[PDB]
Amino acid sequence: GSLTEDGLSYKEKFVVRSYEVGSNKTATVETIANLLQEVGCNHAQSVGFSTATTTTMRKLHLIWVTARMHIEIYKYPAWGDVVEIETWCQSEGRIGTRRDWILKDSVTGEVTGRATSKWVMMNQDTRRLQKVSDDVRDEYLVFCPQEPRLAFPEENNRSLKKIPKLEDPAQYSMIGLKPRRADLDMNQHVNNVTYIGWVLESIPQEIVDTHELQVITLDYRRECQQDDVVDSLTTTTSDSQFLHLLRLSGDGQEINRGTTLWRKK
Template sequence: MLKLSCNVTNHLHTFSFFSDSSFFIPVNRRTIAVSSSQLRKPALDPLRAVISADQGSISPVNSCTPADRFRPGRLMEDGYSYKEKFIVRSYEVGINKTATVETIANLLQKCGFSTDGFATTLTMRKLHLIWVTARMHIEIYKYPAWSDVVEIETWCQSEGRIGTRRDWILRDSATNEVIGRATSKWVMMNQDTRRLQRVTDEVRDEYLVFCPREPRLAFPEENNSSLKKIPKLEDPAQYSMLELKPRRADLDMNQHVNNVTYIGWVLESIPQEIIDTHELQVITLDYRRECQQDDIVDSLTTSEIPDDPISKFTGTNGSAMSSIQGHNESQFLHMLRLSENGQEINRGRTQWRKKSSR
């Protein structure tokens, strides 16, 4: 997880990140939530009490935008999490007729909608502040197939002065089986200077209205790989795909490369024999620098042996070599870097499982 220090403004010359427009879950796009201190009053409904962006006063939401009326999602009874159902379309599946990991990542972005086009509170808009992703961790237990209906639940919560966290749970709508989970870390950036900033009390009070009162995590904090540090991949890498170029379609509304494109670039340097025989189970990405349209990117991949001393030396047939080879084929470290100067764009880790017969 990214750690910000008092001299964060000096540190920011080195790192920047891409932004996402789907951070907050649901209010009318012409409104902004009241501060958490106001919402503690018993007579005030935390779901309906808002401050009008035009009038600056507390009032209930009595109308919605045309987009809201057609949106298939809904707030849950607690008012803090949001659920939405998605049908897996034919153009969202791969050769196995199951959704790709890029499809899953796109659905996570689509679930929920923001207070305005840049997912900011009223104070953030005044100060030209936006949320940007620092880490994304996705685990997929079962890939949905073409025409399956996936229900996604999402919610966000405060991470103190550092930023916020957003989690997701994916379910098969027909069986209610949990088929995936995801979590992400977000930090605040000045849109003009591209520098990170600490979260102020004023901003924090405004977005706390969206957060559960008690911590709620898609993954438990103890012993889960979503928190595991990703070491830097050193040259020479075992596998590489060089000089990848962003397309116009890869750019988001802020004219920077969308996060799903990063996932695709990471997978470009996975060896073909793994793609043929395995499917992605876990992906973790740490974002360190924005990528723009004119940038040229190298994708590097190297096998990683898990930090398990027993599995390193004991295989199913007693052979240490066969055990290491098995792990090497299923877990990898990744780095995306600028081709021109070698600066890191992001680093990642993936875990793969053998494809099951369908």
């Protein structure tokens, strides 16, 4: 992978692997999410960030955390195919940062998917949200386009929709979900792609066998610890739409909420 001519965005080509595909021999939505994560890490590596916290973020125990992740896929890359992903960042004033992705077929050059994520500042010890100071902004703005560049431009689009809380009783459920060591990242925290998988575990197998995931919007409220147990809840709201909710199996503490949209194969 490499930064573009202007150094204000990064591109990388990936060859879809055998174990990265589902029953239809195309990459899963979790393989795609992992690829988005990898190109994002490589973009921060290429612009100076060590093994993406700035200088002011290190002195003050501050980290970027995901608050929302929205993905729209038109075509899932087949096993053995090359997918090209372009990623960039933009300041959202004092609220935080946004990271966008464009997925293209390396052969045809056509856009096959797009994603957007909203990140907020947070103390890594107390977990208190806070806001992007002023000294922090100057350190990362030199790597962002100043003019807006939105993967989801549309006025009144799916990525900025308010998601309600799933009302009990849920239509479907997957209980007793626990992260293993493969679900953890290098910092021993549950990887954000695991939550996508957990949300999709309560979708019935018949829906998965006859439909394809077109859109998925996930809101992150709290982190699931290594020793926490999760319940995954789904209710049809409708193409098929679903409302989702992940909560701790014990006290019922909310960790995630979202929506999915599926299309007949």
